[PDB]
Amino acid sequence: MPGEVQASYLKSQSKLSDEGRLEPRKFHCKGVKVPRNFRLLEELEEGQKGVGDGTVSWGLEDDEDMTLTRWTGMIIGPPRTIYENRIYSLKIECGPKYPEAPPFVRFVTKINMNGVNSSNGVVDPRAISVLAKWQNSYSIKVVLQELRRLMMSKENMKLPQPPEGQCYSN
Secondary structure (H helix, E strand, O other): OOOOOOOOOOOOOOOOOOOOOOOOOOOOOOOOOOOHHHHHHHHHHHHHHOOHHHOEEEEEOOOOOOOOOEEEEEEOOOOOOOOOOOOEOEEEEOOOOOOOOOOEEEEOEOOOOOOEOOOOOEEOOOOOHHHHOOOOOOOHHHHHHHHHHHHHOOOOOOOOOOOOOOEOOO
16 A cells, blocks of 8 residues: 555645655555576476476486576377377476476477477477476476477377487587
């Protein structure tokens, strides 16, 4: 309740007209959200430790960082699919505003996704759902889990796979 009254006062003739008032105002919304580094640390353990059938793994690139930017995402192929029985490496960049906005994900290995290029592996957030409508509950595991989920679908599980699990860069 912004105002200019606490208890007492003095001098007051017009209690309706403006006369001369200048209250400090600008914004009209607060900023609520879960800590960024927190998700990284908590998710760092969950990813490094392991997941259901180890379908993916979101570990750290350099075990000597602070904000944990250069991430690494592993992925396994699901039986009964073009990708089935095929590992996949990834690198997720998370800097300014990560769990609050679409991260910069890029496949290191050789992968072919409708939203991910077949040269560098830059995962386009326009194609990826989790990235398009990125939320606060999303994380690296969600990114890896979601993208891989599409790979299992008929859409991505039809594209021609590479003749090896080599990376994209030398």
